[PDB]
Design a protein around this nucleic acid. Structure first.
Ligand SMILES: C[S@@+](CC[C@H](N)C(=O)[O-])C[C@H]1O[C@@H](n2cnc3c(N)ncnc32)[C@H](O)[C@@H]1O
Ligand SMILES: [Mg+2]
Ligand SMILES: [Mg+2]
Ligand SMILES: [Mg+2]
Ligand SMILES: [Mg+2]
Ligand SMILES: [Mg+2]
Ligand SMILES: [Mg+2]
Length: 336
RNA sequence: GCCGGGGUAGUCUAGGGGCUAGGCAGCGGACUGCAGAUCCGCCUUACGUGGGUUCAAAUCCCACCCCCGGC
């Protein structure tokens, strides 16, 4: 209410933290000053209880509207649930989305008319710091582990530069696999690496795991996807790691390399490469293994039925599907 | 070296004199299942360093240190 307290600049702040504290500060208008006076817009209540909640004198001057700019914009989650409640209650739109670089990717069901998907994309382009909005069009389809997309708003380019854990990376969300949600898992690995380790990243994609191991001596980044290597090379030079990370284009099975730290970032077919990974890792070395399952028992069983190994750590990385998870196990391979 | 835009909670991004940020990650639950997923709870005041204007600084000033692009 225009009914705003009028004190002298001097005890401004002190007096303001009291008005807000007692929840009597009308925060929909700006504070103002004219000379040595301070005009705090208060809510309303006889200056008899105001003459008590504080001890300095004042007055109640009722002034016009100085308007207050809207601070924050609402949230994508906040709005889609109010505008599309029906389809949400139908599980036909996700309030979750991820951001790779400066591009966003939403999940909207095929039922949703082509014209509304665009209205949603156009509503996420407006409500989220980005330059483009897409939509998942399929699951991660084998081989190069790529996922079909669909443009919905903004710039129609699939290239961009994601920045995580102190390093930057070139990514093409259209021809190469990349997950901005796996940065936590890379930080995990980042700490385990050693100044003397030699790291073999069996399926390096664009190199997020490789660059993450910048503390090691040498690093081999292998990938069968030709589009992967390109970015990988660029990623290597962009991070000043040329005489450290060696990119190789090939089927990891055909690579004759050797190392003490091996990363197996291929959750679904990882089990079909244990043989190569053990053939790669030096004795005493460790194998970062990823897989999909409801418990660790099955992975532990494979490895054991193949070498004397010790499970250093074993944790749950993320939910993979209804009641299924992506698991991570760090095996110490001593002998075999 | 000089101009610019910056350093934002673990991480990454918006904001830009008095409002306490949005995501991921993390933690706890849920979903009995072709999903690198979704879904519900909880993380309720963080802005490089030193000093300076102001009743009030993450914001404005100056300086310095590092990023990022320019000549
Ligand atoms: C899960 S992606 C790597 C993702 C990356 N670590 C990330 O999170 O950003 C799998 C990669 O393994 C590669 N790949 C698939 N089969 C392979 C094989 N037999 N040998 C080597 N690389 C392979 C694919 O080309 C793909 O780039
Ligand atoms: Mg910024
Ligand atoms: Mg946060
Ligand atoms: Mg959980
Ligand atoms: Mg700043
Ligand atoms: Mg400063
Ligand atoms: Mg303040």
């Amino acid at each position: 209410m225009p009914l705003c307290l009028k004190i002298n600049k001097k005890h401004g702040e002190q007096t303001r933290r009291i008005l807000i504290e007692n929840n009597l500060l009308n925060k929909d208008y700006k504070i103002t000053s004219e000379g040595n006076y301070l005009y705090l817009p208060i809510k309303d209540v006889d200056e008899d209880i105001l003459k008590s909640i504080l001890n300095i004198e004042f007055e109640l001057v009722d002034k016009e509207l100085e308007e207050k700019k809207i601070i924050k914009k609402p949230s994508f989650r906040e709005i889609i649930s109010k505008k599309y409640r029906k389809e949400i209650d139908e599980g036909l739109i996700s309030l979750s989305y991820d951001v790779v670089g400066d591009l966003v990717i939403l999940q909207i069901s095929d039922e949703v008319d082509e014209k509304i998907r665009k209205e949603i994309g156009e509503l996420a382009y407006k409500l989220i710091p980005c330059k483009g909005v897409f939509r998942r069009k399929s699951e991660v389809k084998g081989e190069f582990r790529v996922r079909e997309l669909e443009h919905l708003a903004g710039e129609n380019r699939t290239l961009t530069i994601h920045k995580e854990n102190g390093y930057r990376l070139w990514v093409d969300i259209a021809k190469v696999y990349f997950s901005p949600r796996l940065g936590g898992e890379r930080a995990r690995i980042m700490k385990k690496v050693s100044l003397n380790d030699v790291v073999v990243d069996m399926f390096a994609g664009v190199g997020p795991f490789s660059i993450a191991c910048k503390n090691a001596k040498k690093i081999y980044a292998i990938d069968i996807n030709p589009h992967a290597i390109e970015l990988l090379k660029k990623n290597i030079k962009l991070n000043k790691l040329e005489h450290k990370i060696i990119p190789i284009l090939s089927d990891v099975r055909e690579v004759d390399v050797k190392g003490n730290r091996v990363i197996m970032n291929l959750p679904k077919f990882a089990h079909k490469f244990i043989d190569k990974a053990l053939d790669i890792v030096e004795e005493g070395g460790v194998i970062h293994y990823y897989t999909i399952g409801k418990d660790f028992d099955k992975a532990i069983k494979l490895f054991e039925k193949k070498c004397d190994c010790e499970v250093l750590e074993k944790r749950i990385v993320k939910s993979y599907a209804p009641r299924e998870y992506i698991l991570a196990l760090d095996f110490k391979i001593n002998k075999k």
